Amino acid sequence: FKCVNSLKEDHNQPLFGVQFNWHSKEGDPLVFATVGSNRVTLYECHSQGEIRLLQSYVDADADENFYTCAWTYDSNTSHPLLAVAGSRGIIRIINPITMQCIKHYVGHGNAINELKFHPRDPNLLLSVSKDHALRLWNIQTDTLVAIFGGVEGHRDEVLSADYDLLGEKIMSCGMDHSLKLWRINSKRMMNAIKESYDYNPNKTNRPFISQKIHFPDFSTRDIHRNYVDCVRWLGDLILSKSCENAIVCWKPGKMEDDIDKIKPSESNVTILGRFDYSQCDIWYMRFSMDFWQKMLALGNQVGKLYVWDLEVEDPHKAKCTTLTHHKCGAAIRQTSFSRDSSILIAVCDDASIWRWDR
């Protein structure tokens, strides 16, 4: 990777998120979104490092702070869609072409810290909240499918979550120091998703009933000793981090325990490796992976990028490379690889955007 360009957004506030559109069409340029202040902005990547500014959506409320965004597509038309959310607790579905807000959703109106789309169903949107719950939405029928919470759920803000390969289960994490597993391939959840697709409020008298899921299928506080602010599945293993200068690779149970035989009372974890780094001991710093999960990237609080090659036989054999530029000194809150991993974008606390090309 070589640094080919940078720019700064005019609001001068932190950029909390960046995401390439991995649903961009053949023959079209690569596009990424950034979120920070009360806006979302799209850019196209062009030759000679050019980062071409397109158009923003700016919230009507000057005090909105978008924290997260995620791409999907319309299941009938194929056109890409961009979901954004943050401090107001409003999920907006944005038409990226025109930057129109197509529609919006509200749970209880508390801040949303992360959005993720299901890996196999473009309509299933997971939101994680300041109010300690996760919410699963069906954005085809505009229904709240399920709320994951209760006293055995998270006990402080939920900061991140991730679906596994096939979207059979979710791992969530947050300020309570815990990581929690929630299976969504149970008979109950499969039925709830089916019912969400069969719901049309114009053809019935009933409201749509959301599931209350009050018991995780696994929970641990044994991985980290502070806020857990990013989680991703790596097959049946988990990668997670806190503010302790480490990404830990671990699994529920003992070494030979199958993830799908793990019971809710399981008290053990197994540590398969740990990727250490420096100067990333502030809260709220995200790592990202490429589409194929060959690579992992994390920025630190003084503008250094760490990239790990995971194309090795075991997690602890990951190969690290580092990327620095003398003008890049602000905290990097999130990174995003293009789908082919030819481009890596980093976004920062000073509203700067950094492009690295392979």
Ligand X SMILES: COc1ccccc1CN1C[C@H](c2cn(C)c3ccccc23)[C@@H](N(C)C)C1
Chain residues in the site for ligand X (CB under 6 A): 14, 16, 67, 113, 157, 159-160, 229-230, 284, 286, 333
Q: Which residue has the tokens 């039925």?
A: 191
- Cβ proximity to ligand X: between 80 and 174 the closer is 174
Sequence-distant (≥ 6) Cβ neighbours of residue 97 within 8 angstroms: 79
- Cβ proximity to ligand X: between 14 and 149 the closer is 14
- In the complex, least distance from residue 107 CB atom to ligand X, rounded to whole angstroms: 16
Q: Which residue has the tokens 């999920």?
A: 91
The residue number whose beta carbon is nearest to ligand X equals 284
Query: What's at 217, amino acid-wise?
Result: D
Task: Give dist(CA 70, CA 199) in Å, integer.
Answer: 25
- Cβ proximity to ligand X: between 113 and 138 the closer is 113
- Cβ proximity to ligand X: between 67 and 306 the closer is 67
Task: Give dist(CA 208, CA 107) in Å, integer.
Answer: 14
- In the complex, least distance from residue 64 CB atom to ligand X, rounded to whole angstroms: 12
Q: Which residue has the tokens 């923003």?
A: 56
- In the complex, least distance from residue 15 CB atom to ligand X, rounded to whole angstroms: 8
- In the complex, least distance from residue 70 CB atom to ligand X, rounded to whole angstroms: 13
- Cβ proximity to ligand X: between 85 and 318 the closer is 85
Instruction: Give me the helices (H) in the chain, please.
Output: 187-198
Is residue 92 packed enough to be buried (19+ CB in 10 Å), middle (13-18) or exposed (0-12)? buried
Neighbours of 167 (CB within 10 A): 17
- In the complex, least distance from residue 286 CB atom to ligand X, rounded to whole angstroms: 5
